[PDB]
Amino acid sequence: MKFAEHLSAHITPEWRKQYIQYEAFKDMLYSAQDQAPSVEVTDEDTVKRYFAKFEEKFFQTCEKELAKINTFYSEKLAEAQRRFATLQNELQSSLDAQKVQHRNIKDLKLAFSEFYLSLILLQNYQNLNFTGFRKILKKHDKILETSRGADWRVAHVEVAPFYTCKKINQLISETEAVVTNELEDGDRQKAMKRLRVPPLGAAQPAPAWTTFRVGLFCGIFIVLNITLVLAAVFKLETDRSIWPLIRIYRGGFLLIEFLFLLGINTYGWRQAGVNHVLIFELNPRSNLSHQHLFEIAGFLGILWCLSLLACFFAPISVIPTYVYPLALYGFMVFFLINPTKTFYYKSRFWLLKLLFRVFTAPFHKVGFADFWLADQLNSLSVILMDLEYMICFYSLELKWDESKGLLPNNSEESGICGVRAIVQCIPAWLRFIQCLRRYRDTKRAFPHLVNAGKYSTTFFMVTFAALYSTHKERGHSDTMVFFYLWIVFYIISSCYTLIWDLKMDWGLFDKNAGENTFLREEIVYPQKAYYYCAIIEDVILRFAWTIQISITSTTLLPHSGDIIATVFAPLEVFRRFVWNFFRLENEHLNNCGEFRAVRDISVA
Incomplete structure (x- = not known):
């Protein structure tokens, strides 16, 4: 000590x-x-x-x-x-x-x-x-x-x-x-x-007020979750489809979980030494610690549980229940686009500049932050499907004439409500176009043209899943050829993304492993069991991510598909959480070789 x-x-x-x-x-x-x-x-x-x-x-x-x-x-x-x-x-x-x-x-x-x-x-x-x-x-x-x-x-x-x-x-x-x-x-x-x-690195303790707000938002969140479980067991009418509610409140929960796991990622990066500051191009005198991410996640989760509780209890009778999800997501958007200089302005506007640079990204030169956010969107792809479902449900299926909204008695649609696939590939498309821009920029065909087919495999998987789904729905004959095509592209995509995760995203399985068997030459995280458990978990969770993509953009398994997606989406966010650690470690070990501690600010 x-x-x-x-x-x-x-x-x-x-x-x-x-x-x-x-x-x-x-x-x-x-x-x-x-x-x-x-x-x-x-x-x-x-x-x-x-x-x-x-x-x-x-x-x-x-x-x-x-x-x-x-x-x-x-x-x-x-x-x-x-x-x-x-x-x-x-x-x-x-x-x-x-x-x-x-x-x-x-x-x-x-x-x-x-x-x-x-x-x-x-x-x-x-x-x-x-x-x-x-x-x-x-x-x-x-x-x-x-x-x-x-x-x-x-x-x-x-x-x-x-x-x-x-x-x-x-x-x-x-x-x-x-x-x-x-x-x-x-x-x-x-x-x-x-x-x-300022004293930087692991050499600063967060303000006591930030830690107190983390602990306060965590306790409220915990008690409100207990209350949500109790109100789901004892207060939800047993004759209504709670599935629209689950689908609407699923994206918010994935966002809260992503922010929590990103806080844990920042803590691990700050402790093990891999400085995300130099890699993300953040200025070393002001960063967000893990405490700030935990506080943001806790606040947003408090709002999430409050909206869900209001949906279950229906506190006041004048306002119908569908206002609560609308209010929650409208506040989430107003938090991000807050034009004033309060509540994490620098962070929110850096994130907004990044989002404009990833959602319009054949034109901007790709950095690491433009790549990490476009890779994180692959895991937060159920959020976009949730947004599309919310828009479709409010435009086509909500009655608006009865206070009992999100929970209808019994009625459905053609599938669940074409444009439920496109909104699954969207992030694969962003990353595909970014890799193409990187190839055009660097003219190095290996790391960029490969890793562009990585997402074309997702394209083909979603396309053939949708085709087989529609052809088995209308009872056609060329449905079996399409089932084999979908299964072959599922295998191809799972192995493609799995090999890229371990080989040249994490650096593992290199010839110069040495005593760190099946690992890199130099490992940053203390335990060796972390790496082997991460390998096994990624093998398990990478295969149960293409299944979810295939089942979310289809009509097969109507009753079990939703349970499958609900169980597998937080698992995919956890997979991205695990992937972040070793991607950032591999990237930092490049900076360790050239002893680079400060960015090379060009000037023209």
């Missing part, structure tokens, strides 16, 4: 291999002390010899660590000096060409903010490495009752060209001078507000 965990929590995740390695030293010391021979059953000269050999070993490995740190610091400082040179040249060119321009100035501001972050990270690297050297040499002096630890400290650590190099501080002062004089016209307060680096 000291500098070991302080170091693990304050490490820049992409430079983890180039830190002090505190715990290795600690274990070395404890094992040396443990296997020390006797003091009177053995010879004292042998004890002196053993302790001298351990001291030699300890100081050899300490010299190795110091050399590693010096090398890394020199490389990073040279890189920062080059980056400052090119940034000053860019600013000089832009400002003398000044005598569009707003975009140029915004990109220059952003590039100077990322250059400052790298300097702050290198400074924190220096500080942590020096404090780790002092603490571990102190532990060596304490365990062995000697003074060679502090001797080695004063002799070697405080001469090293990483503790005596006051060159990062000059760079920071120079950067502040540049940003204040040339970009802000004085006004150092505004420059430093843009440049100041």
Whole structure:
């Protein structure tokens, strides 16, 4: 509960291999002390010899660590000096060409903010490495009752060209001078507000009020769920179709579950080290923690349970029951599109910019956030089918003449209410067009043309499911050819998406696994059982996702299809939750190889 965990929590995740390695030293010391021979059953000269050999070993490995740190610091400082040179040249060119321009100035501001972050990270690297050297040499002096630890400290650590190099501080002062004089016209307060680096990473605890709101929204949600179960068992009339209600309130529940599991994903990413901040292109000084996602999910789930309770109980008699789902989803939309600057404005508007860039996406260049949201829409595809069902049910099947709305006595439609398939492929279509744009952009046909057929398989599956459904409904003859076609495309799609999940979405099953059998070379999440359980769960849940797609866009199994979809949709959201972890880990391990901790803000 000291500098070991302080170091693990304050490490820049992409430079983890180039830190002090505190715990290795600690274990070395404890094992040396443990296997020390006797003091009177053995010879004292042998004890002196053993302790001298351990001291030699300890100081050899300490010299190795110091050399590693010096090398890394020199490389990073040279890189920062080059980056400052090119940034000053860019600013000089832009400002003398000044005598569009707003975009140029915004990109220059952003590039100077990322250059400052790298300097702050290198400074924190220096500080942590020096404090780790002092603490571990102190532990060596304490365990062995000697003074060679502090001797080695004063002799070697405080001469090293990483503790005596006051060159990062000059760079920071120079950067502040540049940003204040040339970009802000004085006004150092505004420059430093843009440049100041809050304690980031796992090194910040969420405000107590956010955690209290998480706990408050969770307790209300829990009690309202108990109340919903009790009101479903004891208050719902036993002569009405509750299935329209289930279908209407199914999408909201999937959204709440997705936000909860996204909060858990953010917690796992922040703890294991894989920084979604650099991958999603979020600014490192302000992110949403897992607490904020939990709070959003809890609030929306509170509203969901309140609307469902109002449907079951019918509190006031003037307003019919169909207003409650409408009200719930209208508030959900008004929360997202809130034009004022309140209730997570930056997050909501980043999400809206992303949604405009994924729903119109043969034209925008694909980033990681444009790809992750279009991949997450594949799991939240029952939400779009729920929206389509709500529109169809309110337009064609609601009476509007009786207060008893969503729950009708007995009546149906042709199927359930063509355009129930198209709205299943919609996200597959978005991802297909995005992969095509990525191929056109990078001209690399392997990762992009493959992974475009991955969603064409979904296209074909839905098409042939619908064809066989309509042909068995009207009792035709060429229905069997279509059943075999659907089964072959179901198998093809399940294996295609399954191989892509494990191979080049998670990185698993590579030739250089090593001792992590069937896994990557370097794993980030602690337990190895996490990965094997994830593999098994994805194998199970990937196959029971194409079945749901086939049964949601069809007319077969009318009575059991709805139970199937209701049970399998949260399972698919859980599958996406599991997939997020290892996709983000695989993406972060790319950034670990090039030691990239800050984004490369281009400017033109």
